[PDB]
């Protein structure tokens, strides 16, 4: 099951990867980028910094929060990188 | 479980492969079989098996005990098949059990530093970041008394790298306890009567705390100068260049501040370098070189003089070091505020261009680097024109590093400075230098490419007379053998047409315009993006009424080529159809706009987002040509004959033609689409109707009425699927419209997204609670208290669960509101429930 | 990608067993912390009494410890 | 008609103060300060030749500023300024002196918009050093940023490190001056989870605050609780104790009616208490708090500045053998009225910015200690309850150089052409207790002109012939003048019963001299009577010069809270002043005896008060409005017709189904506005056939109203407690008859600012008409109606347009922060429109063809919306 890290954002900026680029971490729209997207320091360290907050892959772009959820302050909950609760280290 | 086991975790692990009996065993047994079960669930375990491991490993390290645990660690850490993350992971487990051991790791910091301090020299910048982690958790954990009786021993140490190592590990003990810590240490380490290893060790500790703590050294500056500045006479050759090293780490850590800390060196440097040579003499200059930019100008004036005249003689040093440093030292004090332009002139770049600037030094990349950047920043402060006139003419030498050389410098310094300070003579200098090194280009350089376009664009229209000869040039190069070099002169030309433009050259303009239309057969893709590119800067630049070829001839040309594959060709082709539809469609039939939309259709779904982007645009712009009502009859046509896959691009279609044409021109064809009894044209109604009020924003609040009773069938309509998206539709409105006035028609709403509270379906409820939140957004968070309050306390646990998850979004999302709008609540037997202050009343 | 555990989580959020007595503290301790946030209702309500701002402030932080009185047993 | 559209211009900005903070904002020698006047943050220049106060700038930051610190890294000679507000967000700014702007450096986010109780913003803590900085709020969460810089000297922040605790609330934090060791925070705390479960109710009073130093391990990089020990007193508030090589590196906490100084490790608790004036006058229950304080540090001593809740400052100084204190001493320096803030520029001047009315800056003379007043310290030796003693006296160690004004705070305010000047003035009730006032305000920035009163005032109306005022000054906590001299004279012949034949000659001449001494009170403050004691009088006083035409002083405990001049039908022209009171009202938790409604008759040109009767009533008469030959008149819940009997007022007719309590009454026709304390508006028919009173329509909102002003004969314009001004509007042809209609929003907005004033008027003859509206913290503003639909596109686009290119300057969202309570509708910011001069040029050029403009026209319709005021 995948959840979100929802930890204390900080100073890094979430990326995300050439198959989702333009989409909102959250609600899954392409409408009306707004927010940059900041995440956990722990979800920036060593190899995973510049990832994708959904895959881990490559990041080529700057992840953002659609107008929708930046309205409703859905930029204030924490870090959204993506979680699997499943998955180890150094799986997939 | 037992989590799963790679080959290499079996030499570490292989002992919970084997089902003892667990009571057989002895005490240390067990707990090394414990301690080994712990590591493998946070090394291989799930996020929460990882959690609760390292939560039992850190509430049992004292029972453990500081002996078993880094026995089992060490070697899992420095395992060569050991990856970062997990790297990392031991490295978080050795700094939990070190805060919770304390001094229980004083007879083991030895050895574990001896284990794990190689990993301060790895390649991997996290490597040596865990490394001095793993050594100030260590220096915490243990005390300062017991890292310096561990770490001294090795202080005159008779091999060098072993002194390295020790000034690195005292260099971050001193980060982690505080350099006031180490202070009395160092003060009699530095002045070590009994061998100089030991003085070079201590100043070495100094240079590295000075390298790994950077401005957080200021407090303590002068202490580590006064502790370090007798070094810089010693008897030692090696200790007075140790000392040089570290008075210009000092200084470029303490940048800008701290010079007063320093004046006891000033004089000892200044003698220094009049009598020593070679790597002493270098350390020396590299401390004054650091030093200067921190004075004021008077006392920078002095002292850059003082040693002016050591440093112009060791501009011709054979030593490449040197000269590295020297390069360093002339940048950072010409940089430096008093250090006069004209002084610079007279004084330093005569030398300075005869011994640095040769085709020697563009042979390698460090050199090649130092020395572009030193000369820019000394065009920063002595004017363009003074230094580009003195390597003008280099660049037509044959060499063409140099000539790289010389031209990237060119390019940096007519960006960061411009043209006005240039006059006729060095101009003319300049084009033929441009133009012979564009001309004889063997590898394509992007710098000549660079170089052109800036030299030109910083000319502006002084580069009229010119034109002729260097868009000869660019049409020569397009129709070279090789398609790299069409690439890069159709670049040239996208970089320079506006300049262009404004020189009045529309004939040269319009020929370079027929070449590249010529050249849309191009069957290399990025060739063909870079014609595309062209090709749109000469549409801007001409206009539309005087382009050739003429837009009617233009545009069908372009309509087979959005079906390229190529992301560049793609967004190139789809930006110059998009200008030609926004500033040109008069050249260009119906039909052939809607042949354009119909490729155009499946540009939607892209993955870049930069190509989406072109082709909503150009969308937008063909709809508000060409109208309507057409368009919007394909789309509907294709909405009902056609699933999914290709739904969703016509529904974002049909939303660009109701943003750019005004929603009343589609909103009663798509909702009379919506009478049709098949269901599936519903719900592909509902959806494009979702998207379009999501796409439009504020411009739907003057639709909320006209599709209220749609909403109103819909959300009471037995397919709950048409429920969901009838509450995602209201979500959309209502967040679209926030602020504009809507909050009648958004409360008639709200009474048909209520009922569905109940609904079990997650995909349904969840559509419910969102198109609640964006109704809390527009009409506010007490109508929405209001219409919870009823529920709160109901006597059915259920409608308590069902209010009480509303109640939370809502208070989540309206906590300080709420407080003009909790209703009041009386006093009872045994509480108080008023709240007395609200009401005051003056 | 979804729960409710962080809104179980956030102080003044409630549930099918919140008691009338926690809701109405929640209710008043955010109107105590509002009223020393927003400067002018803070001004109405020492301009009301006779009191200053600190000691409006004070009076409303002492408040906060129980300021609806004992809660009950069952 | 359509809905109205309204455009929103402050005419004069908030004059009240919160928070003063002073430093090198220049990065010169020169000393500024910058001020939070609420959603305004300004910057001052007070110069030391003229000793006069300049305003440098002004910035709305539309959010509501909670807390304000300066701090600057080790080696800078710039102060920057970091915010903490209702944004949910933390900001540092640097002021730019080049462009006279505030320059955003970061802004980091950490949770949800607005006052909330669990989001940091309410606090703000700094190390001394620089290197980082808590901001807290009141329960649970604390939030820690490292600062930093990097190769060019530029500010650098870190991500934020965690340090909640569950069930924790936080009174106060203030960063430890431990040199540059771990930076310590230390708070006072307080831990709740015992007393939400203890049903019988004693661990809440076994509950006791904490003071707890949280470390910030920079190596490590967390922060842990450290050190915490509970405390005998409670405190309100912490003062940093300058340390490493500067002091011993304490914090003196301040509590009821002592000061402690605390340290970790093995200092001892140094208590001593407040010294508190002899023969006080205030009520002998009641404890002492200091309100504020400052820290001033020299090369060779530093000292502080304590005032009390009655304006004396005490020069506080602590005594250090070894590197423990030996004691705390203090002394008497000066009174100065009530300040939320205090500064000690190194000039030499102290900077006071009172909680309420005028702010002030003073000349440090001299420091106090080469006179012969008593020093008071924690060493000297007190048995029992005894708590030392000192007299007030005028000012010895300040003399003032410059008072700024300020309105804040506005009860009441009437636009009229009282002094036949054509253009109308503003009369404006300001001012709290003695240093109450009226002030008249005319256009040309307004100039004004104070008048002082004696209590509160709370209402004022004004009488059509003599064109004369008739206040009523009201006050909690306050003794009669009767109630003041009996006291006096009281406790002076008590102070000779006590004590011995010895001398009478001695203490009966001192009591004498003690009745002969009259601090005023407009500078020392009046005596605090106690709960439930009110203070009340009524004042007929001249509008163009400041005579007391007359004055009536009510008895104890009663409190004058609506006022009317009117006429009756049943008597001729004769002129009446109604005013309502009421007797032994207690606040908190309310109740009340009663009240009386006074009948008087005006006589002597509107110059005399003459006593006619005076009629009891069961609950406060809180509203009168004259209507039609008789008055109406609001007791509690009830709404009364009431006809003037010549022994008492007769109830004539009566509605007794309002929700709770009747705050205003306003009529128009047959149709009365009742307002209700916390349910908004009721229409009320009056049928004259039937006599009867019937309720026929409301709102659907509730809405804590504070003033109203009705539009037409359908429209209702009204403001509430909470900064947001509203208009409703009955739906077309609402009979009068039928039971029930609900009234229509047509307008919200959050103003910012609680408003207590509201009037449609035209404050230029020649000019349209608009609603003006005061606040608490003396803002005035108008509301303007748009003429032509294209007009207001224009302005919403460039309202649109400012909101994402200007965005407010402490994170807040513009659109959110008009949206605080209500969603805006149908009003438009010009206060953010007219931002569009303090953008950079670009930005002005690209959004001034986003609209096809130039930027000159631009400003030009900006401004000839403020020229033309309608
Ligand atoms: C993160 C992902 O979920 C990963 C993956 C593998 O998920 C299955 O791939 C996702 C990509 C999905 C794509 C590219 C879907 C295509 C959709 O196309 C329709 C027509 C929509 N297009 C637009 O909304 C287009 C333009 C909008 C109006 O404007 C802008 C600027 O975007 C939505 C999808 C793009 C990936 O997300
Ligand atoms: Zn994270
Ligand atoms: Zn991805
Ligand atoms: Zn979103």
Known sequence: ???????????????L????????????????PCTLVRICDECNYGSYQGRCVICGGPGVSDAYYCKECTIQEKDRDGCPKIVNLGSSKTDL | ??????????????????????????????????????????KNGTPPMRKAALRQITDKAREFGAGPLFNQILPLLMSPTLEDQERHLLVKVIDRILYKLDDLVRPYVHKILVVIEPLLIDEDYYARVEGREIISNLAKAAGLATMISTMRPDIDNMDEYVRNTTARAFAVVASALGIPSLLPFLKAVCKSKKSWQARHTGIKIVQQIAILMGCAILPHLRSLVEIIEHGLVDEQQKVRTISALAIAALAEAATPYGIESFDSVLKPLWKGIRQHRGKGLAAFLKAIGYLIPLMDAEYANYYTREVMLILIREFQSPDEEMKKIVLKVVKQCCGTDGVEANYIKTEILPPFFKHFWQHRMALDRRNYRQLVDTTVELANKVGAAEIISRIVDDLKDEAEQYRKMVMETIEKIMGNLGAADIDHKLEEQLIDGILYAFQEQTTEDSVMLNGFGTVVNALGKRVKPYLPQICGTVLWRLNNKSAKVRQQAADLISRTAVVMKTCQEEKLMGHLGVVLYEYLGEEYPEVLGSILGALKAIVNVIGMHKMTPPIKDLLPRLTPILKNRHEKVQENCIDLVGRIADRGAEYVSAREWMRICFELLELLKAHKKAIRRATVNTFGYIAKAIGPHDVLATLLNNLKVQERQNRVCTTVAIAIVAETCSPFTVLPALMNEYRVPELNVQNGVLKSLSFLFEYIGEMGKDYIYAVTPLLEDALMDRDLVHRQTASAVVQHMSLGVYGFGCEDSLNHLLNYVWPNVFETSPHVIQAVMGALEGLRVAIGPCRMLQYCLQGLFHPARKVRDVYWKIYNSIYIGSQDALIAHYPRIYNDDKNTYIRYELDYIL | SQLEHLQSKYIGTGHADTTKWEWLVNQHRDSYCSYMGHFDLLNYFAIAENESKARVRFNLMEKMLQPCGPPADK | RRHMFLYNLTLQRATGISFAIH??????????????????????????????????????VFGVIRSLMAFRLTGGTKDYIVVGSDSGRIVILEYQPSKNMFEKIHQETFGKSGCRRIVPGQFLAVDPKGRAVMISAIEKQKLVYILNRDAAARLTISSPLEAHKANTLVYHVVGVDVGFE???????????????????????????????FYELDLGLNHVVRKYSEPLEEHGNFLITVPGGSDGPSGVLICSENYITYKNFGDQPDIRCPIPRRRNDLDDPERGMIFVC???????????????????????????????????????????????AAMCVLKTGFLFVASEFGNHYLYQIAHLGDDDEEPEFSSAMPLEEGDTFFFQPRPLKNLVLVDELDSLSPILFCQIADLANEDTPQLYVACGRGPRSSLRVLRHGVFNQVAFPLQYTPRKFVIHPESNNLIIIETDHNAYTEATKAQRKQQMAEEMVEAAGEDERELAAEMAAAFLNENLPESIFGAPKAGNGQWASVIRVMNPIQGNTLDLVQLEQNEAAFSVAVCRFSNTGEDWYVLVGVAKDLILNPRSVAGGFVYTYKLVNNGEKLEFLHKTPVEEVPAAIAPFQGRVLIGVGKLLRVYDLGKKKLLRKCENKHIANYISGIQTIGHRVIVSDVQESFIWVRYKRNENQLIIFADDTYPRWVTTASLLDYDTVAGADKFGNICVVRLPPNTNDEVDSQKAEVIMNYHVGETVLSLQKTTLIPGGSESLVYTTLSGGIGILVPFTSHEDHDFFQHVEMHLRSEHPPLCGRDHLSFRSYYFPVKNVIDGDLCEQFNSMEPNKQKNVSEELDRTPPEVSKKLEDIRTRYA
């Open chain 4, 23 to 60: 430093g090198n904002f220049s990065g010169t020698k020169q000393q500024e300060i910058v001020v939070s006047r609420g959603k305004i943050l300004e910057l001052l220049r007070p110069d030391p030749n003229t000793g006069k106060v300049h305003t440098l700038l002004t910035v709305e």
């Open chain 4, 293 to 339: 304080s400052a820290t001033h540090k020299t090369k060779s001593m530093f000292f502080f500045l304590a005032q009390t809740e009655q304006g004396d400052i005490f020069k506080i100084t602590l005594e250090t053998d070894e590197d423990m204190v030996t004691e705390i001493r203090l002394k008497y320096f000066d009174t100065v009225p009530v300040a």
């Open chain 2, 1 to 42: 479980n037992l989590p799963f086991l790679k080959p290499d975790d079996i030499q570490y692990f292989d002992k919970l492969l084997v089902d003892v009996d667990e009571s057989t065993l002895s005490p240390e047994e067990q707990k090394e079989r414990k301690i080994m079960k712990l590591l493998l669930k946070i």
């Open chain 1, 17 to 32: 990867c050439e198959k989702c680029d333009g989409k909102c971490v959250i609600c899954d729209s392409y409408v009306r």
């Open chain 4, 182 to 212: 771990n930076p310590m925070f230390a708070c006072l705390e307080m831990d709740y989870e015992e007393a939400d479960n203890d049903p019988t109710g004693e661990a809440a009073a076994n509950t006791q605050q904490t003071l707890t």
């Open chain 1, 1 to 15: 099951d995948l959840i979100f890290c929802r930890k204390q954002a900080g100073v890094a900026i979430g990326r």
